[PDB]
Design an enzyme around this catalytic site. Sequence first.
Site, PDB file in Angstrom:
ATOM      1  N   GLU A  50       7.351  10.579  -8.635  1.00 58.88           N
ATOM      2  CA  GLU A  50       8.516  10.255  -7.807  1.00 58.88           C
ATOM      3  C   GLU A  50       8.998   8.866  -8.198  1.00 58.88           C
ATOM      4  OE1 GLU A  50       6.179   8.420  -3.912  1.00 58.88           O
ATOM      5  OE2 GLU A  50       6.990  10.421  -3.809  1.00 58.88           O
ATOM      6  N   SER A  52       0.795  -1.196   0.000  1.00 59.31           N
ATOM      7  CA  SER A  52       0.000   0.000   0.000  1.00 59.31           C
ATOM      8  C   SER A  52       0.845   1.271   0.000  1.00 59.31           C
ATOM      9  CB  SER A  52      -0.941   0.051   1.225  1.00 59.31           C
ATOM     10  OG  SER A  52      -0.168  -0.142   2.422  1.00 59.31           O
ATOM     11  N   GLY A  53       2.157   1.252  -0.143  1.00 63.82           N
ATOM     12  CA  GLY A  53       2.933   2.472  -0.278  1.00 63.82           C
ATOM     13  C   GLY A  53       3.482   2.972   1.075  1.00 63.82           C
ATOM     14  N   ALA A  54       3.773   4.280   1.136  1.00 65.81           N
ATOM     15  CA  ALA A  54       4.291   4.900   2.341  1.00 65.81           C
ATOM     16  C   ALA A  54       3.361   4.812   3.558  1.00 65.81           C
ATOM     17  CB  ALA A  54       4.678   6.346   2.041  1.00 65.81           C
ATOM     18  N   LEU A  77       5.179   4.883  -3.760  1.00 69.60           N
ATOM     19  CA  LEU A  77       6.609   4.661  -4.006  1.00 69.60           C
ATOM     20  C   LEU A  77       6.847   3.233  -4.328  1.00 69.60           C
ATOM     21  CD1 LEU A  77       9.500   5.603  -4.224  1.00 69.60           C
ATOM     22  CD2 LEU A  77       9.791   5.351  -1.748  1.00 69.60           C
ATOM     23  N   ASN A  97      13.191   8.399  -0.220  1.00 66.20           N
ATOM     24  CA  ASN A  97      12.733   8.114  -1.572  1.00 66.20           C
ATOM     25  C   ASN A  97      13.884   8.097  -2.583  1.00 66.20           C
ATOM     26  OD1 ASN A  97      10.260   8.501  -0.258  1.00 66.20           O
ATOM     27  ND2 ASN A  97       9.380   9.659  -1.974  1.00 66.20           N
TER      28      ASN A  97
END
Lengths: 248, 248, 248, 248, 248, 248
Positions: free
Chosen positions: A136, A61-63, A104, A79
């Site tokens: 990003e 699910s990312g950050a 990310l 990052n």
Amino acid sequence: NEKISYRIEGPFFIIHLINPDNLNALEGEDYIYLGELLELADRNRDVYFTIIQSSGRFFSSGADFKETSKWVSNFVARNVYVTDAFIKHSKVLICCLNGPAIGLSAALVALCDIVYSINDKVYLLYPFANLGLITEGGTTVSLPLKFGTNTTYECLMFNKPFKYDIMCENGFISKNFNMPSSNAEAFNAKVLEELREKVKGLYLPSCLGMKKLLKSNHIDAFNKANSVEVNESLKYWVDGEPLKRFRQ
Amino acid sequence: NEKISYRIEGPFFIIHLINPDNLNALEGEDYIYLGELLELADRNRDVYFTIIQSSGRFFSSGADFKETSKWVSNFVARNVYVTDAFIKHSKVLICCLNGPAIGLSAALVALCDIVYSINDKVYLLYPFANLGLITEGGTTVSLPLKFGTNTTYECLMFNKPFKYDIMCENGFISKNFNMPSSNAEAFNAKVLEELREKVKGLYLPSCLGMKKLLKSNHIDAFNKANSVEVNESLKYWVDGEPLKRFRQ
Amino acid sequence: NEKISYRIEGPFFIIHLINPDNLNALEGEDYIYLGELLELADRNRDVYFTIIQSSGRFFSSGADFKETSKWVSNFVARNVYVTDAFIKHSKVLICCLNGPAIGLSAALVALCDIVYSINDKVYLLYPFANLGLITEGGTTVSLPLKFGTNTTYECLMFNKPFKYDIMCENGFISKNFNMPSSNAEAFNAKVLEELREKVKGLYLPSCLGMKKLLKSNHIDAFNKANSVEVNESLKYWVDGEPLKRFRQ
Amino acid sequence: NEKISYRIEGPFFIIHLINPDNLNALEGEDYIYLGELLELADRNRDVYFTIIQSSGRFFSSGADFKETSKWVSNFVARNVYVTDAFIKHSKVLICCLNGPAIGLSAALVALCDIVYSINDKVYLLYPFANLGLITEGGTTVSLPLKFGTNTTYECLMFNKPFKYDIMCENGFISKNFNMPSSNAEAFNAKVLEELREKVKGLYLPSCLGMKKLLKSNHIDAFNKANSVEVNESLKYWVDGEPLKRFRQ
Amino acid sequence: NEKISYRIEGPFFIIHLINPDNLNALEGEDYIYLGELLELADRNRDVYFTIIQSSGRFFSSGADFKETSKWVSNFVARNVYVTDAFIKHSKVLICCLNGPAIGLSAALVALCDIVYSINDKVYLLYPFANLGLITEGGTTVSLPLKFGTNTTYECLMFNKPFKYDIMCENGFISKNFNMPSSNAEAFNAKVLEELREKVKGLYLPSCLGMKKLLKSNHIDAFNKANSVEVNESLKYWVDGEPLKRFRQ
Amino acid sequence: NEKISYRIEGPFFIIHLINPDNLNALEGEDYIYLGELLELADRNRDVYFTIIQSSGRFFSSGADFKETSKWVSNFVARNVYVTDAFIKHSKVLICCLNGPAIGLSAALVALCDIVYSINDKVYLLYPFANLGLITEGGTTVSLPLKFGTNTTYECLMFNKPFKYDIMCENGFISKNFNMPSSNAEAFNAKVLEELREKVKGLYLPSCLGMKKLLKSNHIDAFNKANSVEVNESLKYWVDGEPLKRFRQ
């Protein structure tokens, strides 16, 4: 680290995200640790392939979010560091996508050389426009490269997912294993079983030599994107929109 | 200008080709006027998206043809100026393709960031080989970029259309609305209705910031192509083939 | 040369591989001779298209293998010379793929501008990893260009073929003629029949002028790849793996 | 042509400006003819050096000036053609500067590989700012290359000459012969006498091979400058300042 | 701002450092203010030249130094902003060097197009090695450009000044006025007097058009250097050496 | 190795050519050994400067010459390897030129960052045209970089030396020590004495960080030149001129 393990098996350095209850959401320190693992694989002369595997229904699910608020410097620094580690890695990077990947961690899936999918419900989501941020993780280059420029604008501009059908229409997924989402564990092992059969007979240093030449096509563009994505976001952070939206 | 109107609606600057009886064929002055409209949208700090819409069954049939014949300088100057305006535009460019587009106007459709189609009868045709000319409008770069190099050679070398099936196989069309060709008006409005729903919640400056980074991947190549397409055609004009064929 | 013939027919310079019993396997001298034929076509002001055609069930099985063993210098010199001839050719290169192509000859198929297939059993195989070698023939650039970067890694890293379905999913094949593999002769002639109809009416110098501009997009990358593929392989040869595997 | 002669002497193709009464001022046709002479030298397999020599007290005073006034197209076309001929020439270009050179002809002196001066009164003048024009002849690149960026701005911005002392301080002149300005004829012959002695013993194809590699350092920049100088000047001509000042 | 004034005089926008008691040492806010002045000159359609003048015996002694210590972000942000302003300025930048310039202010002198010196005691010093820092202000590119690569290494590696003799040997100074150091005021006015005479007769838009083409030779390198100098220094700051040495 | 020694002294890794009777002529193995020494210095975290010193009246007379004659492959391989070692070296390279340097060894002097001369009789000679060869050692780029393009053509085309006066006029020599040629030993020690005084007080990692940024200006050009010089010479060797002349 308790959320990520690794092991080596013949020519394969295997990295495993093992926090399924939290949908393998990652913090800054987990992204550093992932970068350090790729460094360890990159310097091991016995490793030829670096396989990234996860667990549960999501790949990630990312950050993970929980003037000391100038805490966005360690955010931006983590990052860049983990993106740079994926960009320069010299071993064949293989993602086993056992479910969706967001942010990310979806950017890092797009930096792997080869991607296998558990089933047709996987998707990649880059919700930069919804967080008051910009591209990003090298997605400025990797998304138009792997999905085409018009499709990339539709997804990024409108915060829409790159779904399975789009991924197959672009050859992003080398093989869909069509397994239930309730067992990433069995999909992980069947990818490793096929990989062990496909390397038999091959001259493994030839894989690395072809990758080195392959990577020189876009490596400068990727390093440049990593640096200008970060340069460009700074004003978004100075304005404070992301901070507000990140509080949500 | 009577063939082209425009209006602004929230973050959308809408440009509309409104000469359906003549299949929105455009003259040099209509292509200048289109470039000036993009300049006006580009400098409006409230606009985030520049939507191009047409009318009738064709999006546009291309250039309208009716030593003063050195009239090819204003021709060449109008192509460069409107191509350069599409290349450098900083707002998200969206084409609503309500039917086929031919020539320069098909070149401009290939420079938009996102393209929606009314139905599966749309096609793009670049009949340079049939007019004794060469690539124009930045199609030297945009066609291999968006349709692949082998497909681009088949179409361009043999004056064959890029049809719907080819457009979908490359992700050139983000969404086909499958509406009759007798009502572009309703398709135009349904694209705007979906767009108004998809921007809700988003941070609109993030769209422009991602576009700025996205565009730096090929922007030098596009500016270069605009200048060498023009340099290279001059001998075709000096030889006089296009003049003859343009008399047809 | 007895394995390769050629002839000119209007604007078409036709090259024909005519050694079906040996699956049009080629030696160093056959690859030089192919390069010299492209030079002859390139300097003929009446030729606009260079059509490559073969015979039998295979387009070509690749290199024919039967310190004087420093015989790898003439090997490496013949690969560079024929790759450079395909890269710089100024006439429209068209491959008629009458069956599979393997190795260098599969690398040259990927350097043609347009490719037609006899039927859905064609495939391209680049078994570099199985021969202890790395990319050659400009495939470092041409494979990710025409098939996408993830698909290229799957095929090259694991010595797997680029099959028909992959070729169609990327627009690599402009038209499949769906003819039996027992008659390349009839497929060859039907491609030439369609070509004669498609050039009618066209201004043929426009084909060359568009190709010149089209080729400037990746020409430096292709020349660079030709030189670094060769530079990089030298240590593979010094180590001796290819020599052993080539003895098989 | 009566203003320019040429001859070949062993490996030397000698070009001579022979209109001293008019200070070897050149018209468009003289600049074309100079370009064609360089083409003839470039294709002569016996020539290794192309020596440019003039006559009288000036090397050349530059362009000779005596909507048909759209006569600036043949002007601009003749500048590009002769600049491109100097840029791409493959033989060693040597200028014998027998006096000052102004404008385009001073731009061509800056494109030669080696320059000898008759005496310390030579100078190069580029009076673009005084004619309402901008850099031409590749001087955008050649002046900062050979005289340094700050010195180039002083001279160009203020219409000041690059004099002998500046030329020596930058190594622009390989040898000053210190001869009176009343005999270019004797200086011309003494340069040829020294040249005949310096080539003795040398492998002449080595001169061309080193030049080919040397020229690849800035050749793209030079070709680019030739095209953007011309693109950029067009608005100066459309405004009409140069036309007025050229009437003076 | 009390340390810096400005005024416009015909085509000249004049900026004057007027803090001679402190040797025109500048703080972050003075470097921002200098950047904003260049923006104002750049947008004034009547200005063609931007003249930088100072006062007293020094042109400028550089940066003025008196986890809030994360105050190095505003430091780094002010260096980038004022460097970027000098790099992209479109008007002819002229430095009147009335004495030595050190650090960032010496970096900005190296970004001007033309430099005049009051007398032979001027020098430029870049004491990066003595402050535990690396190149800044675009000096990575501007120093080897204007003084040559070996001389740049001697000065930078050993914290040695670029003195007058070195500046003249490279054409860095267009004219030395040989005036006492006790009157910058009279030198400033005599530079302006010569400038007013040299622009007479000239077409001033030609100066800007030549500068635009001139600047495209190294503009990407300069923008790149500005960004990588800053990226690269961050670890020097994280280590803390500069902080210690800056406390001295 | 008996012809070359080395030692470390604080931050200085000192390499010494100690075969004065043979004018420090070097064979292939001496050039490999020199490359390996630079590798050892490059990986020593205590070394900041790599000083190259010689002995006697010559710095070095160049390559020492005494189908096995295909011995030119080890020749070409040793030139590339030692050039590549100088190009990529990360420590400050300093040449102490105690007399003339010819050929490859003169090419390596032009790749050092800083050069000191014993007296005004030093010279660099690149006699490629006299050996039937072309530029080597990266001199395609380093000579025009450090001596200017016109001077480089005079010297290279006519096999003439770059003498002291030319070296000083270009800032190639940072300091001439004006010592007799009969004692290189004392000049070597006085350079080391000045170096020990100039590094005092400095932050030594700042030297390496500035060098890393400095080197990125031309590093791609240097690597490219190393590869195309070698590619281009191969036909000179196939023709056999160098072989004949090398027999002399």
